[PDB]
Nucleic acid binder design. Structure first.
Length: 90
RNA sequence: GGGAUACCAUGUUCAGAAGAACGUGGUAUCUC
């Protein structure tokens, strides 16, 4: 299918190059009165592949990955980019 | 007695392209 295992595979394997600067930030810190946690699938400090939320947070973590592999246009877009990438980059 | 997050610690597992990440021991809060 297309989740967790398949996700991590997409992110790193499919779009896991050098300098990409992945950035899955965790927000909404879970609690014993509302575990619910949302993830921020972003990279480069200005790119959001998607977002995810879940009760046991994992669904949030996963949903996060599944979120990044949900934007083929963005995914592939990076493929080319990764290949292009000009000079003078930080 | 079931289940969920988390803390200290430790590792296994998913996969089976690739590699990521979750698990596990116990204390506790909540909850059923």
């Amino acid at each position: 299918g297309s989740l967790d295992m398949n996700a991590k595979r997409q992110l790193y394997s499919l779009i896991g190059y050098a300098s990409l600067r992945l950035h899955y930030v965790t927000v909404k810190k879970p609690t014993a009165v509302d575990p619910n946690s949302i993830v921020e699938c972003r990279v480069g400090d200005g790119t959001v592949l998607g977002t995810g939320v879940g009760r046991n947070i994992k669904i949030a973590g996963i949903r996060a990955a599944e979120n990044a592999l949900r934007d083929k246009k963005m995914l592939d877009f990076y493929a080319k980019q990764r290949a292009a990438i000009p000079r003078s980059e930080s």
